[PDB]
Amino acid sequence: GHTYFGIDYQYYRDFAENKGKFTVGAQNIKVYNKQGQLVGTSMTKAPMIDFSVVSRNGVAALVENQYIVSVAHNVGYTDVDFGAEGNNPDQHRFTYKIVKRNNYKKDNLHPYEDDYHNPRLHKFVTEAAPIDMTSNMNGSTYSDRTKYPERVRIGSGRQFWRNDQDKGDQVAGAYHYLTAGNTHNQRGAGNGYSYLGGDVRKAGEYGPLPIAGSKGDSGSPMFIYDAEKQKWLINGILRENGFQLVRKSYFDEIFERDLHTSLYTRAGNGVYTISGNDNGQGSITQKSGIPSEIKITLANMSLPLKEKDKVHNPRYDGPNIYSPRLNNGETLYFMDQKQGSLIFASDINQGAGGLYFEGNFTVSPNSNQTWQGAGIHVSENSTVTWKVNGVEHDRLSKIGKGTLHVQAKGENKGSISVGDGKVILEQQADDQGNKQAFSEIGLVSGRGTVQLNDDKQFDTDKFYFGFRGGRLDLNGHSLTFKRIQNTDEGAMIVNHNTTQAANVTITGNESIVLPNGNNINKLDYRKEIAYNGWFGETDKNKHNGRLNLIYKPTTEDRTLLLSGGTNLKGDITQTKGKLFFSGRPTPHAYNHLNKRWSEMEGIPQGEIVWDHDWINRTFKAENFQIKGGSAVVSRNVSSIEGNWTVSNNANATFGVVPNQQNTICTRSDWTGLTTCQKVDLTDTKVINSIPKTQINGSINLTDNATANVKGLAKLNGNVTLTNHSQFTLSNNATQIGNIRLSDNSTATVDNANLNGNVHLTDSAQFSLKNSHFSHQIQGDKGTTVTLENATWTMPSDTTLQNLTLNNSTITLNSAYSRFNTLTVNGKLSGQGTFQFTSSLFGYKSDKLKLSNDAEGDYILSVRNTGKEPETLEQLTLVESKDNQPLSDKLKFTLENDHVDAGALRYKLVKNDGEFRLHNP
Amino acid sequence: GHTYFGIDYQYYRDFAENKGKFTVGAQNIKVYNKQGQLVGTSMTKAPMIDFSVVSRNGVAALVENQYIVSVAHNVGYTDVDFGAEGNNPDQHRFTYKIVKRNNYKKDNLHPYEDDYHNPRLHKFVTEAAPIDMTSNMNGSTYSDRTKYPERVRIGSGRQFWRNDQDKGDQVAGAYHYLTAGNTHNQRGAGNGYSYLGGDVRKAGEYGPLPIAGSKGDSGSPMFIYDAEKQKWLINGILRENGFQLVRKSYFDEIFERDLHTSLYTRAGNGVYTISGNDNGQGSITQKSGIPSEIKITLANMSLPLKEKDKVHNPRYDGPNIYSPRLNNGETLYFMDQKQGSLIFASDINQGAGGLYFEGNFTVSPNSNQTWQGAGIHVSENSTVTWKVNGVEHDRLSKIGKGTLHVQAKGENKGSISVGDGKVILEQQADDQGNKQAFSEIGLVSGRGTVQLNDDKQFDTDKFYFGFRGGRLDLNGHSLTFKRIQNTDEGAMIVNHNTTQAANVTITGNESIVLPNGNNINKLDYRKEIAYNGWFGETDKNKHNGRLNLIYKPTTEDRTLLLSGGTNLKGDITQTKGKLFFSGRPTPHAYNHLNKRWSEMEGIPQGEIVWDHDWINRTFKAENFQIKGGSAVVSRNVSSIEGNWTVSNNANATFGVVPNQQNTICTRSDWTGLTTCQKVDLTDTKVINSIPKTQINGSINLTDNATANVKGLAKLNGNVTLTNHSQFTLSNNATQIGNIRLSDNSTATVDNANLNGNVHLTDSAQFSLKNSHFSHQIQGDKGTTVTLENATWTMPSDTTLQNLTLNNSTITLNSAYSRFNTLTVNGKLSGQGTFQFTSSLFGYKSDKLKLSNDAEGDYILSVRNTGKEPETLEQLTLVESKDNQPLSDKLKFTLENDHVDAGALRYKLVKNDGEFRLHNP
């Protein structure tokens, strides 16, 4: 298509991929031109369309579970696929095959032009919900912009951008990638058609991003928003541009041709028996109803797998490939109001025919009969007990809001894609002890759930969350993964069991030594693995059962990246390796442009990632037990909630520091690869975009554990240390809470803000560097407090043991800028300043109480109020803790050399073993 | 004398010592016999006599400042002393020496019998005010019992008690101790005499305790109450018993013989110059008046210190010792209406002559002249500026209501006894820098005041409050004591300065290791010291200036007992050791009886202390700052008022517990020694005699501080706790106020009554054991409430975090014996009962809202009112705080298994994650 070079190409790419700000449902997206000026606001009258119904190759759209729409003259393509762009193998993109083209035939009862077809696919599509069609064939219907306020199109035809002189550069050939936007303005319409066209340089009546089609865009879909229904509908297919309106009545004729057999037993508890053979002939016997026997059509093996379909217009001649063998199968519809039964008397290959179930059914083999077909659709509130195995190298498609309770015997060699509703896994062991539900299991489209009703149902290496994921409900069971295959934040691991807890263990990749051969999956041999999804249920109306997460790699050099979220009623445990809690870059459409046009556009080749444009995440658990290795809470984490226990030689670090390098872990949407690397955080825009992490919990360090809260982070909780643990608050981070040190632990506040109190015992040490502190410090026998380049404003009477000063100032009383005393029971040493307040009139003041061990060089500064004393006494400033005299190694100097209280001049003297203010 | 064995000997002993109920001024003292029957009521028509005017040896009474009265035939005694019984060295009892006997000579102008003398003492007596004499010599005068309703006597003659057969046991020899009571009945009187006599077994016209004299009682005084004057007067001296009436006219002749020189200058501003020499010759020069020179007599050193006085009756021959040398001195009287002057041109030794000053005087040495004499009497409203030093080993006696402003130079080696009025200390340093007002200073008789007008005026170890004490007015100055020498509650330390605060520091005894040598003062080497007096002014008409008290011993094992009172405008601070606020046993006369007669009387040998008979005390300060050590409020403290702050590892304990041992601190009146020891409190009479201490203030605990209110105590205030402080209310004590816990503090109510609310935050804990509680408890994140063997009746909606039950019951609503909800946001656990009220008719009830953490075994009891429901619903009783279901570890059981509302039967079920009342 043709875009406007006056607007960033990225808009049109993001639009098509539902990336950047154009996520599904989003509204009011501002669109600026290259001059940074507002062109318009997008999607002000409709939630952003879900383009997942459009095939990756842009030439078709999903209008039913196994049907697409396109132009007949697209005579070459034989299949479609869906989902997100890229080559991340976790996605397991599926190739849906056309088995019947359904090229329109113009005739007395089919008035419209024959460049139009409704292909049937060989499987039910699971990755996306089909889109409804508009029903009126009069183009004028859709001109009303109150009823139809938004209109969009999308395609992969030859790509151009046009400048202000309307000159086009062709930046890509057809079928390379998708571009999209709103359509051009309404430009004339009639029976079966509509024309849209206008000036790409200009904002249109459907929005700031008008886009026209070109060679290769034929067949691509055009969508219209019905504001009354609140639905996006497909309105037409591209044939300025002309569109052939969609044909709902024609589609109905195709559909009813493939689905015409309804099995139903009026009294309920129907019993049906099915059999067939390789020549595509089949039969369904109904226990009692008349007729007892119903003939059905199945996959016909005597027919070619490929053949040339009907061609009704000589212009649209070409390969026109279809599958007479698969298309022979009809779709069956079973309804029962009580408990129905379906018995497999023989293997069944339905070909492109599928199964719909309305009501509960028990489906059972007489022996070991298998099934194979388009897929299974189970109605809302219906449960289908499925006791029939599948076929090797065949994928079963499960759709519908209902439940599929899998309960066949032995090792099922078929796989499954769970697009909608629920699949319960409960395969039974065979006589030989073999038990496997599927050889491979995927959750896609976010609508589906896999629920475990037994152990050892599948190989966890063969389970994946594909495009938009879904729910894996452990239902009280436990699993171990090496790595979890996942594509995005749609991935959810939960436990809906109210009664039994569940555990997920992640062990990381077995080896990081590359194998040989010619189909290496690099994801399996990397030190870094990642999970983009959720642990724990976020839906308030679903049960968030107990769920624990354990990261237990084999080697110290293995990383697990969590970039989605946790809502765990349970703990997260780390035994080794590296564990990152992180936000992630906002997704953006990949840049397919060559060197030249990339340079013209001013964007890098390949992956588009903006350092200032990240998604913010939240994490929550009951406890974080870091028993070993290293846990890191990195950038764009809004909050992490739960209590921390770091033990042995483990470590936990919170926050990234502006103007330094930080290790940043990100996974590529394009390859699925995770990369951890030191990155400079120096850009103002980037720095300002990163939230200060709210750490909502307390921290306990034991043994040799270390914890570090730094930079863009705020600890909303206490820290407790024992043994030889160490805690550091630095780089302008903040803590709202207390620090409690025992044994041989250590704490340090380096250029940071501790809003709370410190309490040491035993041999603990507290260090305050390059900071100001205005709270309480309590230290007893054995403990050492140290200040360096620091100021401390004491709030009240305080006791310490040893205290070491170095270019630091202690203000004894908050009134300096009723009276307090600092007692140093142990050794004071070093050099610095003490700031005093006093009332010479009452001969009262702040006090510094020292022991025989005191020593060093200090400055005394005194602020006195009010009156001149009505008597002559001495005011003690520095005294001994008892009657012994202060050391001669102790040296004090009064600032300004003297203190005046009216006409009375006091100086500093060492008299009788103490330092007093004296009047000569 | 002779007492009645039918009445406790203690009455007669207490009477003589003004102890038990017979304190000075007391009235209506009931006297019971050994059969517990009322014999009579004592002192119904006069306030109890002050026997302090009677010499300790019982043979004389104080009739003027330096004169006594007795019989001439008492020819052996050479001195007298006064005060209280016992050997407490703090009393510094003084030996007053007879310098002239003044044996009566019968002649034409002296009609009466010559067994009578009026001894002159060498010093003015400071410990007691002299008593007036009756003036009529006709014995019949005093028979009128309307005018003279009360009459008493006292002596130390041979001691007997007589039984109902009037048989005497002699229980002690003469001159061992004093006994006293009212006199016998009037039995004949004439010129110069009176006889009193009757039956000791019987109550007499002067009261229930008639007492007769015996051998050794000769000379002892007999007193009569003049009801018109409202005075006790001495009426006669003992010679059934005969008494020689007192001779007022004879005494006047003696007095005028010794005091006949009045110095006076009509125009005011008189100027007198005094000199003398060793031969007892002296001179006073008057500036201008005629004659200019007046001869005076002084101590005559050429005369013997001892000699035999005049003997007028050969029967009364014997030693008759007097002091011709001291008696030679005459007393001088100086009056001036403006400002008079007295100049010492030479040292002066007045001997037994003293000084009276009426009006203001300046008394000055030309050089370093000293003075020595009987004492100084300064008139009311007169000030005598005294610039003359004293003499080593000589005590100066200060009496009169006027002021003595001491302002001499250098180190005065004399001491002083301040009996009356005011002495201001302002010694000036000499050229060499020596400065000392007196080598020793005592306050006695409660009438006197020492006021400090400078620092370093005396050694605080040499200052004492003797018999009945007096006021030490710090007047804005500060002092430190090791121990304060004090005898009784007459001791007062105050600060009358309206402008400058004052501090008293008490440090305790320097060492507790006994010295060697043969004059050890045990009081100086004990761990326990005590102060029987007051801190702060109690007189409303005097200024109660700011005064602070600091107890700061060196070692943890040192105790300070305060058994008197405080009324401090200021604080009490404790840094270490043990501090007791206590009442004290009522004083009782010491038991001098041997083994035999003690056993007969049924009383212990030695000190008489009754465990049920204690004096109740009050204490008041602004703040009690217990910064270290232990503060204890012990038995017989009516109230202690002020706010408490207990910090560091300090402790404060209130109340004694019935039926347990309590540490009781008491000081012996007899030895001055303080003893602290565990004592069982098991006697009903003792228990009932102890008041419940009203603690009138609030309590703040910080750091590791602990406080304990228990037993006979009531806290009328709030408690606030921080850090790791702990507070316990136990043993049936009561608190009217709230408890507020923060940080890691803890509170417990063990079998006690908390009338108020509890509020926890952070990690605080509240424990309720073996108690019933009916007020509010509020606890948020982190906090734990615990009940053991307790019931709690919630008053309104309540929120807690964690809650632990153990054999305890929570009644959700006060109506159980409009609806309330208890929310437990955190973990509930344990076992117990919840009592509910409900209205099934409206489907409303009390609620228990729990979280996922809830667990344990509980009983649900439900009381329902009124109607049968006109609809069928479920009534939720126990619910979740949100949509998650309650744990399976949570178990409830409905009491009685069911609830009925008319014909409708509801049972308890767990339905949909909640516990509801359900109708099958």
Pick out its properties.
homodimer, 920 residues, mainly beta, Pectate Lyase C-like, 35-stranded mixed sheet, 84 strands
Total separate domains of chain A: 2
Q: Which chain pair has the greatest contact? A: A-B, 17 and 19 residues
CA-CA gap between termini of chain A: 97 Å
Find the structural class of chain A using helix and strand composition: mainly beta
What is the overall number of helices of chain A? Answer: 5
Query: In what range is the share of β-strand residues of chain A?
Result: 35-45%
Largest sheet of chain A: 35 strands, mixed
| CATH hierarchy, class of the largest domain in chain A | Mainly Beta
Protein name (chains A, B): Adhesion and penetration protein autotransporter
GO molecular function (chains A, B): identical protein binding; serine-type endopeptidase activity
EC number (chains A, B): 3.4.21.-
Function (chains A, B): Probable protease; promotes adherence and invasion by directly binding to a host cell structure.
Write the SSE topology.
The structure is a homodimer of 920-residue chains.
Chain A: E1 2-4, H1 9-17, E2 29-32, E3 38-42, E4 61-64, E5 67-69, E6 79-80, E7 96-100, E8 120-121, E9 151-155, E10 159-162, E11 168-172, E12 179-182, E13 186-190, E14 193-196, E15 221-226, E16 231-238, E17 241-245, H2 248-258, E18 261-264, E19 271-277, E20 279-286, E21 293-300, E22 307-308, E23 321-322, H3 324-327, E24 332-335, E25 340-344, E26 348-349, E27 355-358, E28 361-365, E29 371-372, E30 376-378, E31 383-386, E32 395-399, E33 403-406, E34 415-425, E35 441-452, E36 463-465, E37 470-473, E38 479-481, E39 485-486, E40 491-494, E41 502-506, E42 528-531, E43 534-535, E44 547-551, E45 559-562, E46 565-567, E47 571-574, E48 578-581, E49 584-585, H4 595-601, E50 614-615, E51 617-626, E52 630-633, E53 637-646, E54 651-654, E55 661-667, E56 674-680, H5 684-689, E57 693-696, E58 699-701, E59 706-710, E60 713-715, E61 719-721, E62 726-730, E63 734-736, E64 739-741, E65 746-750, E66 753-755, E67 758-760, E68 765-769, E69 772-773, E70 777-779, E71 784-788, E72 791-793, E73 798-800, E74 802-811, E75 821-824, ...
Parallel strand pairs in A: 1-10, 18-24, 19-25, 24-27, 25-28, 26-29, 27-30, 28-31, 30-32, 31-33, 32-34, 33-34, 34-35, 35-36, 35-37, 36-39, 37-40, 38-41, 40-43, 41-44, 42-45, 43-46, 44-47, 45-48, 46-51, 47-51, 48-52, 51-53, 52-54, 53-57, 53-58, 54-59, 57-60, 58-61, 59-62, 60-63, 61-64, 62-65, 63-66, 64-67, ...
Antiparallel strand pairs in A: 2-3, 4-5, 6-7, 7-8, 9-12, 9-15, 10-11, 13-14, 14-17, 15-16, 16-17, 19-20, 20-21, 22-23, 49-50, 55-56, 76-77, 80-84, 82-83, 83-84
Domain Peptidase S6 (chains A, B): 1-253
Enzyme class (chains A, B): hydrolase
Organism (chains A, B): Haemophilus influenzae
